[PDB]
Amino acid sequence: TMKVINDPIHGHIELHPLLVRIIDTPQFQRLRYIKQLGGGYYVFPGASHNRFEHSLGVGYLAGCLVHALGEKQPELQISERDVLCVQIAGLCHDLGHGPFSHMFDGRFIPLARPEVKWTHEQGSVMMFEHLINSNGIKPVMEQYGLIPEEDICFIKEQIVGPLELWPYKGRPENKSFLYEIVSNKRNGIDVDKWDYFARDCHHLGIQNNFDYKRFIKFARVCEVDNELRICARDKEVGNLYDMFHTRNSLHRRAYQHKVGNIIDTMITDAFLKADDYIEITGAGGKKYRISTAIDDMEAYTKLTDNIFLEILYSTDPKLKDAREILKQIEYRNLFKYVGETQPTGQIKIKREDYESLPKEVASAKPKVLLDVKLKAEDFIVDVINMDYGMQEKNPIDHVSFYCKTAPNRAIRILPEKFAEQLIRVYCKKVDRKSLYAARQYFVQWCADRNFTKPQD
Amino acid sequence: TMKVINDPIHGHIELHPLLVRIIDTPQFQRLRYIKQLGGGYYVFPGASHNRFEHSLGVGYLAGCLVHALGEKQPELQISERDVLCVQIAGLCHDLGHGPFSHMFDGRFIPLARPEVKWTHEQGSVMMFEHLINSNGIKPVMEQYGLIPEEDICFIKEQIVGPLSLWPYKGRPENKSFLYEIVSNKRNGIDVDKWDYFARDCHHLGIQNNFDYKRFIKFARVCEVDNELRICARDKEVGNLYDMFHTRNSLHRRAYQHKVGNIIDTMITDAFLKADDYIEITGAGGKKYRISTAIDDMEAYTKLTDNIFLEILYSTDPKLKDAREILKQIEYRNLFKYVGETQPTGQIKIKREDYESLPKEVASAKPKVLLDVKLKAEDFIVDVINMDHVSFYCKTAPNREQLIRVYCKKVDRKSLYAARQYFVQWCADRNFTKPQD
Ligand SMILES: [Ca+2]
Ligand SMILES: [Ca+2]
Ligand SMILES: [Fe+3]
Ligand SMILES: [Fe+3]
């Protein structure tokens, strides 16, 4: 038969042999050493889960959804090849994640290389191609009825989106709903977001109220404005609300934790101080930095969380400055929270301007002059985005439902409005004179940047 | 005021500032990089938890039990300092675990240094002393009412044991029940096992039936043969049997997994071929081997699961042989399972003769000659090791080894060969006939 995996969130998981061949690969097993939340592990002891089990769950849920729609609506012409293609897309959607997951692409790369526009989804596509190329997956695809020329393009489009009128080339327009499963761009609701909602809740002691298996059993494909979309049963709006609340509770209590995000900036600070002295060997023996390893998948395969311990256990004097910061984490001698603000009604801060932010705070002009002159090297500016690629909107407005009487047409038509971006400032000095001075600079920068007034 | 932890098993737990000082320590944060189940992670994806979260739970449960006894029995004179000592003891009981937990002291060390005797508890006390000294914890202990002379001895004794008559020095026999909490050496029912019963079930998807909370609630200390022992209520024996079934289920389905133990042996083998070339920095620039890092505690502090990846990501030609085996874990090209047996007598194979076992199998002469001759290196033999609880009346509140053999050759001929060797080796060691 085929492999069975006992997941603590989904139960028994059945693995097609093609999936097994993709998993038993250094590019996929790489995800065993990538913390799902990263710095959150040092705040929540149960947050020890890695990207490996998350990807296994996303592929399982993607196959469950596509198989349910096929067996419930034969008119959709869903093939078993389409089921496996969606499963692979769910398995390999997080292949491009770097050390400590969103810390790498969200903060480190913008700080070390602000000129490059890099996302972990781009790396997922590059790592997928490197995976199939380095392990002879294409003949195994042909074994199981797949056509690599268009199916691999279909998988990549499911992971990253269109590759620059129907813009997708992997599947015709009459199967547009297949592009809404692994990563939905219309509303953000997808099986990928469902897996870590349950996984993170399971690992942090927060309660999950969204029954995702109930949602799959009532998911149907329907015609909405001449477009085939995956619709929900009307009697599932209460489950939908519970899903929204569960994501906000995770954001308010875990993702935006004030100490966990500090630790993320400290790990980023150590990585930045160590970027000039670590060497990762790529294809042809070429030495790559931590920041430049994203240009070479052969080197990026060797870039996991152990570079944290490589720096911590290093004896090189060149790495001492970076080693000291990591030692500070073990002693809980963390950076000091100065304050928090928010760009309500303002244009959100972009990744390419992260590097200029601490120099902008140190350049503030407080009225009350103090005997403590602070430099930009004493300030850390943290930008926390609940979704960097999103604009303020209610997702229910982009969710379509169906009735039991009209199971092919949608319906013409308490939720917590959520902040998107939070600006936190930390100081590296620990003395009360500098710590109070940094607070003065920060409140002055909040009026200049036209951000909300800091309270405390 | 004290720090609060959100734990998936126990919920919100409060940490005394002394405990926090011990936690904020590289000697203790080392536990963040030590898989609890080791090779079991490569079979169960949810088993990503480390020893750090488990130690926190044991330190919490031990304090809960002592506090519950003191509150429910003000005659025991259990002081807040007695509570802290038990909390620290459970918090530091596993400080001596090496890479991938029990495969380091249970297989690797006996294979690399068969002459040395080493256990993770005997290393946990060394870790505790090094932890206390390197961080100046004794003054912090005193400022919270802890006297270091008696207490350090107390904490060490309820971890490793006494170092005819009452052999403990940290507490008198009047507080003997305190030594039965973190690790019981009589029947084997401690809060340590309670924590990783629920925690492992929670991460493996295995159903946990024991409720440690309702047990602790109805737990009291009674007199058994003129001695004070922890006893349970007469109607809470259903919880006791659910504990025993959860243990049996965890061993049968998780701790004794086929592929899981094969991965452990494969990781041991790569460590053995990487032992002569990996350098661990120790006390004052000195260099130790992976097998010799246990002699220096500062070198052991830097011995974690990261060794697995320094071998994997290495480019040293001397490390090529070890790097090959770790890569075969990623490609799922594992050792083939040959057979399984157990000793017929009460005698049990110790660790000083683990490396002699594969050659014994290869030295066997099967009764029928065959084509493939097998070397000792082609065999892997790992050893898997595994009613007496007091109670009280509600009215009157008082009064073994398993042997598995694997083959590194994975072809039809060599596997038939290995089975013939294994059957013959079981025959002249008087072991149970292998099930076909
Ligand atoms: Ca992703
Ligand atoms: Ca133990
Ligand atoms: Fe994901
Ligand atoms: Fe333990």
Side-chain angles (χ1 to χ4, degrees), chain A residues 1-116 118-184 187-222 224 226-251 253-358 360-366 368-370 372-374 376-389 391 393-403 405-413 415-432 434-447 449-455, chain B residues 1-70 72-168 170-184 187-213 215-216 218-230 232-285 287-335 337-349 351-366 368 370-386 388-393 395-398 400-428 430-432 434-435:
Chain A
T1 61
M2 53 180 205
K3 246 71 176 231
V4 164
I5 281 152
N6 188 14
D7 177 77
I9 292 266
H10 309 304
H12 286 148
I13 298 191
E14 276 186 67
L15 267 304
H16 192 277
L18 173 54
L19 301 194
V20 184
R21 296 276 319 249
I22 279 167
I23 290 155
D24 298 335
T25 285
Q27 288 87 54
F28 193 74
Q29 302 269 122
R30 202 199 141 236
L31 300 184
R32 293 229 208 220
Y33 326 108
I34 312 288
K35 276 301 171 195
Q36 168 99 18
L37 314 169
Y41 179 43
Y42 301 81
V43 170
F44 304 94
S48 59
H49 52 298
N50 304 310
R51 293 276 161 195
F52 186 77
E53 44 268 41
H54 161 68
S55 315
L56 278 164
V58 170
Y60 166 81
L61 290 189
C64 283
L65 181 50
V66 74
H67 193 256
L69 301 165
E71 301 311 278
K72 180 62 72 176
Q73 295 171 257
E75 52 272 12
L76 303 180
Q77 321 285 135
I78 301 147
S79 47
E80 323 202 281
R81 144 154 164 250
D82 288 340
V83 173
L84 265 39
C85 286
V86 170
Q87 288 193 297
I88 299 165
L91 267 179
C92 312
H93 80 285
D94 274 319
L95 275 191
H97 262 305
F100 304 93
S101 293
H102 284 286
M103 177 214 113
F104 187 81
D105 71 318
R107 179 171 181 78
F108 177 66
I109 302 303
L111 284 185
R113 291 164 85 200
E115 67 272 12
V116 57
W118 157 273
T119 69
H120 71 279
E121 295 100 335
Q122 289 171 227
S124 286
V125 170
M126 295 162 106
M127 205 57 97
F128 179 64
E129 213 208 332
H130 182 227
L131 194 159
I132 80 191
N133 271 357
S134 307
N135 295 271
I137 295 302
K138 292 153 161 162
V140 176
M141 317 210 105
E142 305 173 359
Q143 225 277 19
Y144 297 104
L146 263 66
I147 324 191
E149 276 155 356
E150 55 188 323
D151 281 345
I152 299 194
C153 181
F154 174 42
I155 292 160
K156 295 188 195 202
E157 281 161 337
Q158 272 177 98
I159 286 166
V160 74
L163 302 160
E164 280 185 351
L165 189 41
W166 181 247
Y168 288 118
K169 267 75 162 152
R171 285 298 186 283
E173 189 186 30
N174 75 328
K175 283 182 182 176
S176 82
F177 56 98
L178 293 200
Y179 284 101
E180 262 190 23
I181 294 172
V182 163
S183 82
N184 187 356
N187 53 18
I189 303 191
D190 47 59
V191 291
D192 161 66
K193 232 183 235 194
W194 291 344
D195 176 88
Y196 70 66
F197 283 170
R199 208 163 283 276
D200 293 350
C201 275
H202 180 259
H203 283 266
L204 316 174
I206 310 172
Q207 208 204 3
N208 186 5
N209 300 310
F210 177 56
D211 195 0
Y212 66 76
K213 66 159 146 263
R214 193 105 187 317
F215 213 83
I216 305 283
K217 192 188 57 104
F218 285 106
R220 259 182 89 93
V221 177
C222 278
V224 202
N226 216 252
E227 328 213 19
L228 275 188
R229 285 195 218 181
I230 301 168
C231 290
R233 182 85 143 103
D234 41 325
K235 296 135 190 253
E236 292 281 313
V237 71
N239 209 10
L240 199 94
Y241 289 130
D242 270 357
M243 193 215 84
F244 288 6
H245 287 315
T246 301
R247 159 215 156 99
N248 189 191
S249 285
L250 285 166
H251 272 94
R253 292 158 70 175
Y255 302 146
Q256 302 174 358
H257 198 280
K258 78 198 118 193
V259 169
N261 275 116
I262 281 171
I263 302 186
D264 257 10
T265 68
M266 314 207 36
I267 301 172
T268 290
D269 221 47
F271 282 178
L272 282 175
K273 295 201 153 212
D275 193 42
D276 286 15
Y277 316 117
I278 311 267
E279 298 179 325
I280 299 99
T281 279
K286 337 213 199 152
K287 305 287 189 293
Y288 289 90
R289 291 151 157 246
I290 309 170
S291 51
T292 72
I294 52 173
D295 306 331
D296 198 22
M297 290 305 109
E298 298 69 348
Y300 203 52
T301 309
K302 303 200 256 166
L303 179 56
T304 55
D305 278 2
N306 88 317
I307 187 139
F308 180 98
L309 290 198
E310 156 155 29
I311 294 168
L312 183 76
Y313 301 153
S314 65
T315 58
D316 193 343
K318 304 288 277 179
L319 295 168
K320 176 182 216 113
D321 263 289
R323 186 168 52 244
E324 292 299 319
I325 292 126
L326 296 194
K327 300 280 186 66
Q328 271 180 260
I329 299 171
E330 271 173 317
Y331 294 138
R332 239 43 175 202
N333 283 323
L334 318 173
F335 300 157
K336 309 326 225 74
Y337 171 100
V338 164
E340 179 190 283
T341 196
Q342 182 165 173
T344 66
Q346 296 298 320
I347 296 294
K348 311 289 174 287
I349 320 189
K350 316 223 82 173
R351 279 170 180 188
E352 43 270 61
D353 297 293
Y354 286 172
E355 185 229 347
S356 59
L357 285 195
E360 182 169 20
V361 180
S363 300
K365 190 38 199 92
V368 186
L369 296 178
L370 324 188
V372 199
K373 181 181 178 181
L374 290 176
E377 279 50 82
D378 313 330
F379 297 77
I380 286 290
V381 185
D382 196 16
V383 165
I384 313 108
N385 312 290
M386 296 191 10
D387 205 330
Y388 182 67
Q391 59 93 30
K393 72 173 183 62
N394 208 9
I396 326 176
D397 289 356
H398 317 258
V399 174
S400 46
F401 309 89
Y402 73 83
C403 188
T405 311
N408 286 320
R409 183 170 51 220
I411 301 154
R412 285 182 87 86
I413 42 176
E416 62 309 338
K417 309 144 73 152
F418 50 98
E420 296 310 341
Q421 179 174 354
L422 308 106
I423 308 317
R424 303 230 190 98
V425 167
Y426 322 128
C427 195
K428 271 130 143 202
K429 310 308 218 186
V430 292
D431 41 299
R432 311 67 45 202
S434 304
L435 173 57
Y436 163 81
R439 173 66 186 212
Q440 289 312 116
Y441 289 105
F442 171 61
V443 315
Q444 185 50 42
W445 178 67
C446 274
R449 214 71 156 64
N450 303 141
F451 289 168
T452 192
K453 172 177 181 170
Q455 60 82 343
Chain B
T1 298
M2 36 195 55
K3 316 258 156 21
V4 65
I5 287 290
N6 204 331
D7 177 280
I9 322 294
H10 314 292
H12 284 31
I13 54 163
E14 280 138 67
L15 293 324
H16 200 271
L18 176 55
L19 300 163
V20 162
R21 277 290 254 119
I22 314 163
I23 298 182
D24 287 322
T25 280
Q27 292 88 53
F28 187 73
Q29 297 288 310
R30 168 186 178 265
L31 288 189
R32 286 210 201 247
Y33 324 106
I34 307 274
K35 267 320 173 310
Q36 185 135 346
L37 292 196
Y41 181 42
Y42 299 78
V43 173
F44 303 89
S48 57
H49 56 306
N50 307 299
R51 290 275 173 199
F52 175 88
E53 32 263 73
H54 154 92
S55 294
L56 275 169
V58 174
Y60 165 74
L61 291 193
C64 283
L65 192 54
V66 181
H67 173 292
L69 294 165
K72 212 52 207 93
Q73 258 178 278
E75 51 141 326
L76 290 289
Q77 319 169 325
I78 293 198
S79 62
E80 280 289 319
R81 137 186 191 212
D82 279 332
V83 160
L84 271 171
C85 286
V86 183
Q87 282 197 278
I88 304 188
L91 219 76
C92 288
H93 80 288
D94 268 338
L95 269 180
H97 263 319
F100 300 104
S101 293
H102 296 272
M103 80 135 273
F104 187 81
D105 78 313
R107 175 159 182 91
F108 171 75
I109 291 297
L111 278 192
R113 298 169 79 189
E115 58 283 354
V116 192
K117 281 158 244 153
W118 165 270
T119 73
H120 73 279
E121 304 101 324
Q122 174 239 330
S124 287
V125 297
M126 307 193 165
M127 209 62 236
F128 187 62
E129 245 276 338
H130 180 57
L131 187 153
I132 298 307
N133 295 324
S134 293
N135 299 274
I137 299 294
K138 292 187 205 255
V140 184
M141 265 175 220
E142 278 215 294
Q143 105 182 54
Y144 292 110
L146 258 74
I147 299 121
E149 291 82 4
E150 283 108 282
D151 297 336
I152 301 300
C153 192
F154 187 31
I155 308 205
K156 287 180 180 193
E157 279 172 347
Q158 44 181 338
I159 273 156
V160 61
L163 270 300
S164 289
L165 208 153
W166 193 231
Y168 289 101
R171 289 300 191 270
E173 197 165 11
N174 186 40
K175 297 211 176 270
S176 79
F177 57 90
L178 279 195
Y179 280 110
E180 254 152 47
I181 300 160
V182 155
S183 101
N184 189 223
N187 64 25
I189 317 302
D190 43 18
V191 291
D192 176 64
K193 282 211 222 325
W194 295 356
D195 169 68
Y196 79 90
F197 277 170
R199 167 159 276 114
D200 290 11
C201 284
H202 177 258
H203 280 81
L204 300 173
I206 296 171
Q207 185 48 287
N208 173 34
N209 289 297
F210 190 20
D211 172 299
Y212 63 86
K213 253 286 201 203
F215 193 123
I216 281 182
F218 298 164
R220 280 184 80 255
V221 47
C222 77
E223 290 197 52
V224 173
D225 270 324
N226 271 334
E227 193 49 41
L228 317 186
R229 288 178 64 181
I230 293 295
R233 151 145 316 171
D234 59 343
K235 46 182 64 171
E236 256 58 55
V237 316
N239 303 42
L240 179 102
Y241 275 108
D242 300 344
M243 195 209 314
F244 283 174
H245 176 244
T246 296
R247 182 236 311 140
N248 300 343
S249 294
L250 281 175
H251 273 80
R252 264 191 300 96
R253 312 273 101 210
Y255 307 145
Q256 292 170 14
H257 203 143
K258 297 287 191 204
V259 184
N261 279 114
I262 300 189
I263 294 304
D264 264 340
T265 61
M266 292 173 56
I267 300 183
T268 301
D269 181 28
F271 274 13
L272 277 187
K273 318 198 166 341
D275 180 32
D276 292 356
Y277 317 98
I278 291 287
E279 269 174 0
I280 322 279
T281 327
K287 288 296 171 23
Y288 298 85
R289 271 157 190 234
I290 281 142
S291 62
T292 76
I294 58 182
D295 298 347
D296 182 357
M297 270 313 106
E298 191 40 62
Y300 201 49
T301 312
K302 289 188 284 200
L303 194 72
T304 62
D305 278 15
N306 173 60
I307 297 283
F308 184 97
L309 288 181
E310 232 55 68
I311 300 165
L312 190 77
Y313 300 153
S314 87
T315 44
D316 191 357
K318 294 74 191 134
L319 278 186
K320 199 244 199 223
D321 226 318
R323 206 167 42 241
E324 286 196 308
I325 306 153
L326 290 195
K327 276 181 191 149
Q328 298 310 299
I329 288 146
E330 293 202 296
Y331 299 125
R332 219 58 163 185
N333 297 309
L334 322 178
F335 301 164
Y337 160 83
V338 179
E340 168 185 312
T341 199
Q342 61 192 177
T344 280
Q346 271 207 85
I347 63 97
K348 309 182 244 263
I349 295 187
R351 308 171 166 178
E352 53 165 327
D353 45 352
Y354 277 169
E355 77 146 22
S356 70
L357 296 188
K359 204 180 271 203
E360 280 182 25
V361 186
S363 284
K365 301 255 179 204
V368 46
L370 54 139
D371 198 355
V372 201
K373 184 58 163 114
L374 269 283
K375 284 87 199 81
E377 171 170 42
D378 305 354
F379 289 102
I380 294 297
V381 193
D382 77 350
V383 176
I384 316 135
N385 310 292
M386 303 80 129
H388 203 244
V389 171
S390 299
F391 299 109
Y392 74 82
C393 318
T395 286
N398 196 256
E400 284 199 352
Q401 205 168 47
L402 208 79
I403 288 131
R404 278 182 199 165
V405 164
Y406 316 128
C407 190
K408 298 191 196 176
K409 305 293 182 67
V410 277
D411 41 295
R412 170 117 180 82
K413 316 225 209 175
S414 304
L415 284 187
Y416 182 78
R419 178 76 173 184
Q420 304 326 294
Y421 276 120
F422 169 71
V423 165
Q424 201 44 239
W425 176 70
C426 288
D428 36 30
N430 193 32
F431 290 166
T432 67
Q435 214 93 355

